[PDB]
Amino acid sequence: REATWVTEKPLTLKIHMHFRDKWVWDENWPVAREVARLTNVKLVGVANRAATNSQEQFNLMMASGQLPDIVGGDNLKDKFIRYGMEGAFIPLNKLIDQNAPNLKAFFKTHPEVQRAITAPDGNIYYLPYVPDGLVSRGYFIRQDWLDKLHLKTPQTVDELYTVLKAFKEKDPNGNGKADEIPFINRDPEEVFRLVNFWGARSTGSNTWMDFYVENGKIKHPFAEVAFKDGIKHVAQWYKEGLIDPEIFTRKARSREQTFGNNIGGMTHDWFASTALFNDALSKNIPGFKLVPMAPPINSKGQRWEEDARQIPRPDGWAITATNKNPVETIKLFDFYFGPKGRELSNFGVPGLTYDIKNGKPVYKDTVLKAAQPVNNQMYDIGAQIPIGFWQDYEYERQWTNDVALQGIDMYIKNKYVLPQFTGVNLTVEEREIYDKYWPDVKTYMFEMGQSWVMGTKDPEKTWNDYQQQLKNRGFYQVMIVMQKAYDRQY
Ligand SMILES: O=C(O)C1=C[C@H](O)[C@H](O)[C@H](O[C@H]2[C@H](O)[C@H](O)[C@H](O[C@H]3[C@H](O)[C@H](O)[C@H](O)O[C@H]3C(=O)O)O[C@H]2C(=O)O)O1
Ligand SMILES: [Ca+2]
């Protein structure tokens, strides 16, 4: 028996958690096993470990006439809310009030987080992934390549074009081959963010393809004429091979591949893990220096960083209607928001990945000096996963090197980060229109965006058809309710 036990009799519950297009919940995870030890509740995974589409797996699960005890994963907020109001997921308000002191105290001290997760009927249907920190992504460029080619740090988009063209054409890795790929990214969605260079938005928040507000008006980036004109330029950079030809396919290990083989010249990615490549490749590529770069002055004369940490993220977990132990489940959920539970969900397992030194969790040297970024290492053992948990920036600070720290400081100091969209409060019937049309519109927008970038569709020629399709798919019905909700609140 332990003091943290939420049940005297051992309990096993079924969880469907397919996430980030690769992983599933693993009961064998060191973190999972430690939480199970301390709480006396074991979670067994039922999701298909072979699938590469997490959202599709939720859809198949929901339509399969069977439900597990718990459903977790990334980008599930909208589905948690929709199916919660339908009755597939249970409300957590009373369960938290009566059984979850850590969460109850958390929500009282974080009203913005409570607001962001609450459904229009007043019910909380899931517990969120709550990130910790301020900045997220920044531009990184190969300083050693700039220096070798005798080029200054590009200050404008036009200067950046010249630099990236030089990376492509002037053999900075010195192997006599045109193998260099100037701009790379592990996130395909970042290719759309390049429209920032031409004064267009790609998203209002850390949530991909999110709405934004300009002069009291709700806008979606992909529907704007600025996007049409901006994506033409992105298409041109793709055509000229300045953007990775595999930008939509390469994905997770883009940095390991392109920086590891000394072909990648630039990216836009998180400060800590990206800067860590300087240390990992220090001997393999003598002089490798990937440095934070201020955003280039765009066509609107400004230096935009569009991305920032989003608190909370639209990720987490929920309790289903079929769950026969909702009290034990919410108590398990609450363990994650206590001191020890939070530490485990962030740092891993004590004696394995970290040690308590002077009362503080300190990562082992084997973790810090490892080839893999620490967040990657955490995923492997069941930490830093998109369950209902509260991230602790102290975990990240420990593997944020001086290059990363100084980049973070520069971005904070110079205020590059654009004001982030914190959402509007929809009514139930407004949300019905939202949930009906928006997911499919977003998918269509991505497909069109990819077609435009890759040159299979001409953005100028197809814009009229695209706008008609947006209307036919109900996008402007969604836009009407978005503006209505905004006008009501503000
Ligand atoms: O890389 C970091 O330095 C970093 C620090 C933070 O502590 C945090 O771990 C951050 O993680 C984010 C990063 O994009 C990861 O790759 C991952 O990304 C997934 C997420 O759903 C995201 O929307 C992206 O499009 O794809 C997912 C993926 O795993 O490929 O998690 C992110 C997060 O916000 O937790 O990385
Ligand atoms: Ca070369």
**Whether 438 contacts 473, CB under 8 Å:** no
Q: Which protein residues are within 6 Å of ligand 1, measured from CB?
A: 20, 74, 131, 187, 252, 270, 272-273, 313, 375, 384, 396
CA angle (55, 57, 10) in 5-degree steps: 115
Header resolution in angstroms:
1.5
Kindly state whether residues 147 and 219 are assigned to the same domain.
yes
Phi, psi (degrees; rounded to nearest 5) at 41: -120, 120
Give yes or no for a contact between 317 and 61, defined as CB atoms under 8 angstroms apart: no
Identify the domain containing residue 251 by its residue range.
Answer: 133-310+400-490
Helix-then-strand count for the chain, H and E: 22, 15
Same-domain status, 223 and 264: yes
The CA-CA-CA angle for residues 366, 349, 330, to 5°, reads: 150
Bridge partner list, 268 = 139
Do 197 and 260 touch, CB atoms closer than 8 A? no
Verify cis geometry, omega within 30 degrees of 0, for the bond prior to 30. no
Domain end point (choices 399, 429, 462)? 399
Amino acid letter, residue 323: N
How many domains does the structure of the chain reveal? 2
Please identify, among 343, 377, 399, the residue that sits at the C-terminal boundary of a domain: 399
Are residues 184 and 206 both part of a single domain?
yes
- Among residues 64, 299, 309, the alpha carbon closest in space to that of 197 is found at 299
Q: Terminal CA-to-CA distance of the chain, rounded, Å?
A: 53
Residues in the chain: 490
Verify that 240 and 286 share a domain, yes or no: yes
Q: Which atom of ligand 1 is nearest to the CA of 273?
A: 3
d(CA 353, CA 252): 23
| Bridge partner residues of 243 (DSSP) | 183
**Within this chain, do residues 276 and 166 fall inside the same structural domain, yes or no?**
yes
One domain for residues 379 and 436: no
Rounded Cα–Cα distance for residues 295 and 24 (Å):
36
Alpha helices in 240-283 (DSSP H): 254-258, 271-275, 277-280
Strands, E, within 143-185: which ranges?
A: 181-183
6: amino acid identity, one letter: V
Ligand closest to 393 (CA) is 1
Q: Are residues 20 and 120 in the same domain?
A: yes
Residue pair 325/13 in contact by the 8 Å Cβ criterion: yes
259 closest CA partner among 98, 101, 376, 144:
144
Distance (angstroms) between ligand 1 centre and the Cα of 112 equals 22
CA 174/CA 180 separation, integer angstroms: 10
The neighbour count for residue 98, using CB atoms within 10 Å, is 11
CA dist 181 and 11 (Å) reads 52
The closest ligand to the CA of 130 turns out to be 1
C-alpha torsion 413→418→419→425, nearest 10 = -150
Kind plus residue range of the DSSP H or E element containing 389? strand 389-390
Separation of alpha carbons 302 and 288, rounded Å: 29
Out of 375, 399, 423, a domain closes at: 399
By DSSP bridging, strand 264-270 and strand 181-183 are parallel
State whether 189 and 338 are in the same domain: no
Q: Give the residue numbers of the binding site.
A: 171, 173, 175, 177, 179-180
Question: Tokens representing 67?
Answer: 């439900």
Ligand 1 centroid – CA 470 distance (Å): 30
Q: Does residue 396 contact residue 363 with C-beta atoms inside 8 Å?
A: no
Q: How far is ligand 2, taken at its centre, from the CA of residue 183, in Å?
A: 14
Round the CA-based radius of gyration of the chain to a whole number and report it: 23
The reply to whether 305 and 340 lie within a common domain is no
Same domain, residue pair 191 and 258:
yes
Residue nearest to atom 29 of ligand 1 (CA): 20
Looking at all shown ligands, the one closest to residue 21's CA atom is 1
For residue 142, what are its two tokens? 């190969």
| Residue in the block written with tokens 């599933």 | 24
How was this entry determined? X-ray
Kind of pairing between the strands at 127-130 and 23-24: unpaired
Sequence-distant (≥ 6) Cβ neighbours of residue 215 within 8 angstroms: none
Please state, in angstroms and rounded to a whole number, the distance separating the CA atoms of residues 306 and 462. 27
Question: Which of 17, 19, 20 has most ligand 1 atoms within 8 Å of CB, for mutation?
Answer: 20
Claim to verify: residue 384 and residue 456 sit in the same structural domain: no
> Do residues 172 and 145 make contact, with C-beta atoms less than 8 angstroms apart?
yes
Measured CA to CA, the distance from residue 335 to residue 347 in angstroms comes to: 15
Tokens at residue 348, please?
């891993």
Closest among 407, 143, 139 to 288, alpha carbons compared: 143
Q: What does the DSSP 8-state code read for residue 207?
A: S
Torsion of CA 282, 286, 287, 291, to 10 degrees: -30
Contacts 24+ apart (CB under 8 A), 428-432: 428/85, 428/120, 428/121, 430/120, 430/481, 430/484, 430/485, 431/81, 431/82, 431/85, 431/119, 431/120
The tokens for 190 are 């970042």
Q: In this structure, which amino acid lies at residue 143?
A: Q
- Give dist(CA 25, CA 47) in Å, integer: 8
The Cα 129–Cα 261 span in angstroms is 34
Q: Ligand 1 centroid vs 385 CA: distance in angstroms?
A: 10
CATH number of the domain within which 446 lies: 3.40.190.10
Indicate which atom in ligand 1 lies nearest the CA of residue 396: 7
CA distances from 57 to 17, 252, 269 (A): 9, 20, 27
Summarize the chain as % helix, strand, coil (round to 5).
Answer: 45, 15, 40
364 and 251, same structural domain?
A: no
Which whole-number Å values give the CA distances from 483 to 220, 439, 486, in the listed order? 11, 18, 5
